[model samples]
Target chain A: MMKTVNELIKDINSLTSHLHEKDFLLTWEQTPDELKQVLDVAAALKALRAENISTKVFNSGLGISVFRDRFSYASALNLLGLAQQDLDHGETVRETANMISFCADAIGIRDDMYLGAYMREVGAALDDGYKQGVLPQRPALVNLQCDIDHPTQSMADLAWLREHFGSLENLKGKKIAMTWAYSPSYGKPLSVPQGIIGLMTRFGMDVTLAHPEGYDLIPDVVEVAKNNAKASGGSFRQVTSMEEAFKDADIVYPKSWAPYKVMEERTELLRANDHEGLKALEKQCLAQNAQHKDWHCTEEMMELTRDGEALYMHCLPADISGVSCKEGEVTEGVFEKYRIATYKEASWKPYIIAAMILSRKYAKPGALLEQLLKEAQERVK
Target chain B: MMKTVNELIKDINSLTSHLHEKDFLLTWEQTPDELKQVLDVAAALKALRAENISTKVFNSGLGISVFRDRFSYASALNLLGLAQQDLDHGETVRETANMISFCADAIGIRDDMYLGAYMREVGAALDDGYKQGVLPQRPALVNLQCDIDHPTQSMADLAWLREHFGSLENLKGKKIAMTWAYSPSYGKPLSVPQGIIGLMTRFGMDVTLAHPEGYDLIPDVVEVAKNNAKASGGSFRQVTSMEEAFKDADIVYPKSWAPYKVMEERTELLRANDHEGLKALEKQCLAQNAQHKDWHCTEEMMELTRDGEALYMHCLPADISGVSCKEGEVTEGVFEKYRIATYKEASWKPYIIAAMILSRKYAKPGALLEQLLKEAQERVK
Candidate 1:
């Protein structure tokens, strides 16, 4: 039963990863080998947890995460996301990050404001703190979510893909449709779609990103995907319609997101606290979105996939038509057929998060995994 | 230093506690011996943490706590309290509780809305969950806070008392004034005062509860205090004035709380969403509270204590005259004198919480504590 676990451990040891003491903010920033390390670490952790082994690394330290309002079931992870007003220095953001690190073993950040800039600011401060000996130890920064990318979500998706397709190598030349679908809501993040395109391309998966004309991901992330595709010997393309991307696809991730320009406008409105502007923008965006209501993943859309049986995926709490909304990302039939699969894909999240933390905290995560396996502690008892 | 840890371990094993698989909602529900077990467990955990030993027992499980808007720095503790409307079904609360227990090792509930009825509902559901075998394991319930009592706060206070007094036996015949001081705000829960009186009365201590004419604790809790006092060979008395309660006291707990009737009224108003009625009640209550402005713990009031040097205790975020509020519970001078002491008292809280969870989760907590001590794992490394 643990043969898979043993294999993952061995696979992890073979990879040369530079994730130690580094912040995993974007998949594009990492090498193909490093991405593989994250995947393997997540796989090994998920396996251990499945076998009822304790995957906890720290017994008495906090894994602090900052967010507006979100929570997960990951053990030892504590929320430090508190309400604050326009606030600084000694009061410096550097000092604040270090002060928080005074007790934190690992810090997770999810700042969607400032367009993927806030996490880097915190990470740089932590780097300075570690260098200046202001902090006793360098706490690893895990980007829980940012504007341009969501590494944890992407890594978990990758882990799911590896497990689903049987091997990472099996994903080579396989087509994945990372496309946008219609939603009534506006200001949904572009991170998931960008993350999918950015990461999936790196594993030699032919990544097809599909959205309407205005619904573009950050151009830099698009370039990163293209570069990763070139390096991994895979192909990357952008199409105007979901149908085009879904054609001949092996997997379909039909999720919704706010256009990049719309998000930026919303961010500006939020920062300015311009209620009228925000209301107008939301109204305009929702109307714009309503125009593309036909851009949904339906049973008909599924028929366009390879053998008309593409594996449907979503970072869930999906807005399925007639389920959560009147008309949303995917039709109820398409969503229901792959609901359990999506949940299984989502189940890899905690392990992926744990892997990110473990890799950051331990220089030799493979050896640590080996040690944990040898200890064979029962998590339940 | 380790001798204290070892002694606590030995002390814990000598006690017979029925806390295993039971909810610690109120201290009075527990036997004096069981209360002693909580104190010893808290002390042991604290000592181990101080000695840099990892006190974590569960490697990969959630310690779910339900609260409206509060956070702590405890590791492995997760907040499952979410926004909900009036809801339930097959969808039995029992089913819901068991569903949550599917992943939780321990569940901490803090429901102050129903005057302690809500936690009991959840606890009963969990008990039903365990009996039906719907739950794989009986997740322990720890009362984070409720209307009638705050066991964790009281237990931590007791642990602090034990440490400050040299021993639990040394608290015999000690005079503790549990009095209500004036606060500008209204509808503060009476749990802390009730918890203090109920717990202290069982320790062979002279417990004096003081409040204004209308600011009374629940009659049932008062009667429980009386019964506990008689059983422990201690005396319980109700006084009309803070000065009388403070007179020659060995320890003074001058906290503020709304009257029992006031809390009941507030609860009703909240449930009904009677905005106008609630506003009127708050105005009336605040005016009533302002009338007792002189009923504060001042430097002069401290002079009424034994040798003018009684120990001060507060489950803090105390309203100091010039600090937190203008003319509040305790004067700035008195509060400053015991600020660090109060913090130290509050410091026992995490350990007390951990102890409560441990006692419920493990049948032989003391033996487990000894095992953890023997392992001598570094929590930080």
Candidate 2:
């Protein structure tokens, strides 16, 4: 009386997407077919795991993700994944990318400094490495957060939203507000805010972006979100007041970031590799950020939202008030009330990244998955 | 027709061994049945892999390793086995070990400081942690080079020797000279020499350990080898001259280490965290090490051995004269001739450690292994 993966096997067999050999970098960069396959494969894998099945492919099981020492958030996909490894930066991204890409099954990038475009840079190197015969596989790029986009995080949020609403279609009339809050930390990437607006707008939600006067996201990214909204028959707007954005919002994402001027100055001065200039800027910027200290997701702010109970979302370690030093995203109560919910939101990441990998790793994903059933019969017994 | 694990499956099905609820700390600690099961599983797994089989168990799958930063030979098992994972000195080992033992399947340790005793410490803690109920399974204690036993590396070397000689039985009556040489480095662990004599003597090999007068290994370890030889119909003796042991020998291991006094003073100074004392002592010790530089393995030394081509063996990164600053293990010419040969010796480590893991992790390793055969079919297909 062994419990086999028969039901999940059927789920895998029923998938009808052609995902093989496709590169996954930006979510918007993916085709409808690509996204569908990724979602299914990730879903299937998650289901299999819930059944206590292994997702491990072994030995020359070379898979990817090389983090720069300070590249935070890199752990999202590392544990369930095959390996957690490191190498010297050695400056050049492509050459280093090529070296790490050798025999790899996939590559995930969550680097800082390059912002919106680091994943794309890693993608080109992964592709070229395969071309030069130095690599065995053209690794799919699972974006974490880069110079411009945090595709995996943003897409995972979408998955959470879809599950919460019971069908992605049900999100059509939902009011989702993306805003900024004060945090004592410096140089938080513009990618999270930009990622949220870029993705949520595409789902036919009423998407609002709000921040202080000086705190503006990348102009081009704002335009992309507008285009996404127009294409999806949704509404998109930018507001200066967090209260205005939260007034009737069904979802609230109040997080911090280094706005355009701060983001640009930090990189430019720091690249001269100026140790002193770096700290000097951090000190000034940390102070320059004081004006927005009142720009937080407090209980007062929460009262402004729909039914005063809009779903509070955060890309975690969110600065909570008086949590001391680095205080401000969602309040103690807001985060606690939605703590499990936020965790539920964050949990979609590993699946999304794994989805990104499976989509490219398997060409005939359905059949490839169906064959795994025989193996499960052996394992589960 | 699909292939499945054959001989091993029958063994698994018939398994009545209480490998469950057992702690795997050292090679000698395991019973003949336990050791036989481990070696056979290792051999079968290696054979299956060549025949293209898969061996993996999922879920309750977390694993970890602890090594001194310089416990460099640790990787001989890491990359190929599973989770490339970590910490702490004593207040740490068990508590930290307990933290990692939760829901985990295995724990490996490599330390030259804590010898035969540390694994016992970890094993006791592992048992206690499970009783406390936060621990999932009391993971096996994989003994690495601890105060005086380098089990994995030595056993791996034995595996290589057995393969080269055609069978373990063919090694009987053969001579193996475990002799010390010179290196600019100091404080090299005595475990290598101890591990070799400890394991090699058990196979009925003529085991001769040669070192300079004050350059001795642990006395208890010397006792272990003699005890092993007395039971195995083999010989174990110590000689002052490397050349004396080399005569009529069928195998040779010319390596280096600090003499006893220096090895002790270094540890004391280091633990005292006396930086200046440590550096000052290290300089004094390196000088003391220089007097024995001529106790090296020279080209002139080789002609004294059996057939003048005894298998030149090293646990690798062997110090070669005029090569590394840490000079004189084997001559450059000797090492070059057996360079890839040493790699051959080191390569068995992953499988040996994998074998170590398989034996302890599964209550019935045979059945656990048998399940893999069907998966291999799914994989190979």
Candidate 3:
């Protein structure tokens, strides 16, 4: 057992920054102050729950809804008649958004197969929901692993890095090698690689993104990363050599994602249900990805990073380090460190969500927290 | 908009009742003291909720279970196999008993189909859930209109009576008629009529149960009612003449029930899936019920009671005067006069259940209520 010294969350106002309430639709859309509050509020709520506090704060409230995949339609407007009765988002998207805010909620999608599209779909859903005023407020729509980004994974990684480095500011000027590694599975999404470059650039870090020669990322996001690096006083570069990308880096994130253009066509064919088109795309992508099986994050690759002991990271479910060449990623150790953390990292989405929700729309969280303290409430007693 | 007066809940000890926690399986098994606590605790919670008070008396406490007609089998003991996965009351009766108490939960059943059968089924489910110690803390298994008694409806009626007469003591020696009335519907549960006789007799009232010659009640319950009457210093007698039963009565509960023997047979046939027998019995009972259409409550029946104004009551869904050939319930004067009253009467059930679950097993209702009051907290912002 560990002895506790710090009182986890001392006060609600401990957060010096005043963050405007945001829908949590995307990380890139937010300001640094907003991101700080979102992360802190998330941390505070986690601490509150850890300290044992009841979460239910409703009367004739706290409704749970589980809907089927029918609501996953991009064209929710066309499905309105039946959805009016059968939906958690509400009668209209506005109603849906309003009700979600009313209840405090979040949503995520796992569409990394498509190269730069998950957040686009999630954002579109929010926008679709927003157009109808039936909903008054909306909860955060988290990008769990969208085609363009994996915000939660990247944030958790950043948090982990901050923890090890002592502070997030310590991350400035660090070298991070974001490279595409080999995978046995043909189903890996490019979101992980795309997410790494998009986020790491914002922190004034040297973000080196490497992949197969033909395995380009979504064009716009690559530009966004380059632009972000400039704004944050960081350097961003693209390389074709994985070991070159990892050279002398403080951190190395060698993960997998389907090729950007491949997934782009794949997504369209998926929506269009052009099975023939998908088969053709799938075959070419598979053939191309399989040929690059030599792109494995070999033991030799780690030797290239700082002290040959650089932190190895993954958004996980790595095509692991052992298959034909024992290249699969499980049951390993050493610089294999960061890959093992994918579970805790990915699971952080729910809490980032908790904070996103805990910092609610109408209620002043400071007042609620203070009042909760005065009441001396405890959860699961 | 208006300023709030109450601080919401004052404390858990607002009421001086230390209710014995119970599974609320049935009212008949309870002592009057137990019933009183159940009713009062229920009333207290209702009052608390009306005042917008927080009522979570335990940490992570209490749950509510609502299942459709999926588990009304009296044969749960023999069918515990499929029940392990299929039933809510656990695999056996004992475990089911513990769980309800474990989580201070209440369940609502709508099993008023058979004569003196639903409670038997419900009780057995509790017993099944109870048998294996699967449930050691069984919460209230509310008598939500069982075959033998519509406990809530009758309890509500009694509460209304107590309110009107100043006190339940005022009902002593009061003449009350519980007779069968006409309904155009082919079938009606005897629960309300059975429930009336069973409950009213305990109040030291002149409880007269009347129905057509063949509309026999559950003989065992009739015996229970008579025995309860003897113990409580009341009178319980069955009558063939509705007029005789209603004569000089302060209250008249003229409701409907299928013949006891018929419903009994029907219940078995239902279990057997003898649809042909059910069809035959259905036709036979329909004619029998339809045969006595004149047995409906009319002006003459009102004149038969004392002052010609006995408090007219029905469990509702009354067929109404012009609605059917049997002059379905809502007659010219008394039916219209009493419809509003009946709605209010029916509203008492959920509250009664609230109290039933609120009062606990082996705990004094006085202690529970008072303790609950001390935890006075606002329900919502």
- The TM-score leader among the candidates is 1
TM-score of each: 0.65, 0.58, 0.53
> Candidate 1 residues B1-381, lDDT tens each?
578878988888888888895678889888777888878887888788887887766545655555632333143242111111111111123334544553456776665664336666677767755565434456777787778888888888998998899988899999999999888888888889999999999989999999989888888899999999999999999999989999999999998888878877887778678999999999999998998999899999999999999999998788888888888999888888898899899888877777777788777788988888888888778
Per-residue CA lDDT of model 1 for A319-373, tens digit only, reads 7787677898888788657754665576577667777777787777889888888
Give per-residue CA lDDT, model 3, range A266-335, as digits (tens): 7667767798986787677767777777666666777788998787766433444432235542224432
Q: Which candidate is the best by DockQ?
A: 1
Ordered from best to worst DockQ, the candidate numbers read: 1, 3, 2
Better of 1 and 3 by DockQ: 1
Error of 1 at A32 (Å): 7.5
Better of 1 and 3 by lDDT: 1
Deviation from native of the Cα of residue A314 in model 3, angstroms: 29
- Report the lDDT of model 2 for residue B219: 85
Candidate 1 positional error at B276, Å: 11
Each model's lDDT comes to 0.77, 0.70, 0.58
What TM-score does chain B of candidate 3 reach?
0.77
Comparison by DockQ, 1 against 2, better one:
1
